Design a protein around this ligand. Structure first.
Ligand SMILES: CCOC(=O)C(CCNC(=O)OC(C)(C)C)(Cc1ccc(NS(=O)(=O)O)cc1)C(=O)OCC
Ligand SMILES: [Cl-]
Ligand SMILES: [Cl-]
Ligand SMILES: [Mg+2]
Ligand SMILES: [Mg+2]
Length: 288
């Protein structure tokens, strides 16, 4: 299986069948995804000199899809995800470490990123999951050769939107505005409390992207840059399918992400959640 399309008019019943006998068919599907993509090298990532640049030593970018930094140490734990129409729709990455904050912002600048989506908290169940890689207050900071200033921070019920200005130090006139969307209510290895919340967050970000008169790739990260990051991007793609086609292909969406990075949609619960979001959108639409 590379794809399992479901006609939208059949989705409700198909989902009930997938859930039958304690999610038997859903589990069978999820398990079929287990080895997708795994026939690719993680060689550059496994170099001793790059070891300390990886948050989790099992979660490494493939050579064929890794993002390269300019200059003499080109390594960051980050992977390009191609779009349906053109390469590099997203860059998926881990939560930056103290020693990779500069690399993260260097990647942002070099790849012409204008929007960042963060789907982890910095600290969860008492563990650091992502370092606090932007300024704490309103003062400018250098991160390597870039200057970063926070312009606004808008705390909303379930996510916070921040705007930053970033300048290359050699050309202070040529700044860029970066928007950062931080979803604050998603437990690691788990799912948000409602489908409605993540659906609206994804639609919100998608609307902002669509007004970012084409930017570069959207960066999406969590702690490892696979579970919550993968579920987010999967839901973005699936919601676009529901707006364009009369079939939806959740298996194909996750399959295609796994071709580009390990563990995208990292738990069966997350895979089930994607089905619940589709179910919920379609239920509403049936009556409207
Ligand atoms: C380096 C080895 O680490 C792993 O294998 C991780 C983390 C395991 N640790 C963990 O969950 O700790 C607490 C339960 C106390 C929070 C690496 C990891 C960490 C977080 C995620 N979620 S994501 O941030 O949503 O990607 C995914 C993988 C793992 O579970 O791998 C699964 C393939
Ligand atoms: Cl790509
Ligand atoms: Cl695209
Ligand atoms: Mg370095
Ligand atoms: Mg520094």
């Amino acid at each position: 299986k590379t794809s399992c399309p479901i006609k939208i008019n059949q989705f409700e019943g198909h989902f009930m069948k997938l859930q039958a006998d304690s999610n038997y068919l859903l589990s069978k599907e999820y398990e079929e995804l287990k080895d997708v993509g795994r026939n690719q090298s993680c060689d550059i990532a496994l170099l001793p000199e790059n070891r300390g640049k990886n948050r989790y030593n099992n979660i490494l970018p493939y050579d064929a899809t890794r993002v390269k930094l300019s200059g003499g140490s080109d390594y960051i734990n980050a992977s390009y995800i191609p779009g349906n129409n053109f390469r590099r729709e997203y860059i998926v990455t881990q939560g930056p470490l103290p020693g990779t904050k500069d690399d993260f912002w260097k990647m942002v600048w070099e790849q012409n990123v204008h929007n960042i989506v963060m789907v982890t908290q910095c600290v969860e169940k008492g563990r650091v999951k992502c370092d606090h890689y932007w300024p704490a207050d309103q003062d400018s900071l250098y991160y390597g050769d870039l200057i970063l200033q926070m312009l606004s921070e808008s705390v909303l019920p379930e996510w916070t939107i921040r705007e930053f200005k970033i300048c290359g130090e050699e050309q202070l006139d040529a700044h860029r505005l970066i928007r950062h969307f931080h979803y604050t209510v998603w437990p690691d290895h788990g799912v948000p409390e409602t489908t409605q919340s993540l659906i609206q967050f994804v639609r919100t970000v998608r609307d902002y992207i669509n007004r970012s008169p084409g930017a570069g790739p959207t960066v999406v990260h969590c702690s490892a840059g696979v579970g919550r990051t993968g579920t987010f991007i999967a839901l973005d793609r699936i919601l676009q399918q529901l707006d364009s086609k009369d079939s939806v292909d959740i298996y194909g969406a996750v399959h295609d992400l796994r071709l580009h990075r390990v563990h995208m949609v990292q738990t069966e619960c997350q895979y089930v959640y994607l089905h619940q979001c589709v179910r919920d959108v379609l239920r509403a639409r049936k009556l409207r």
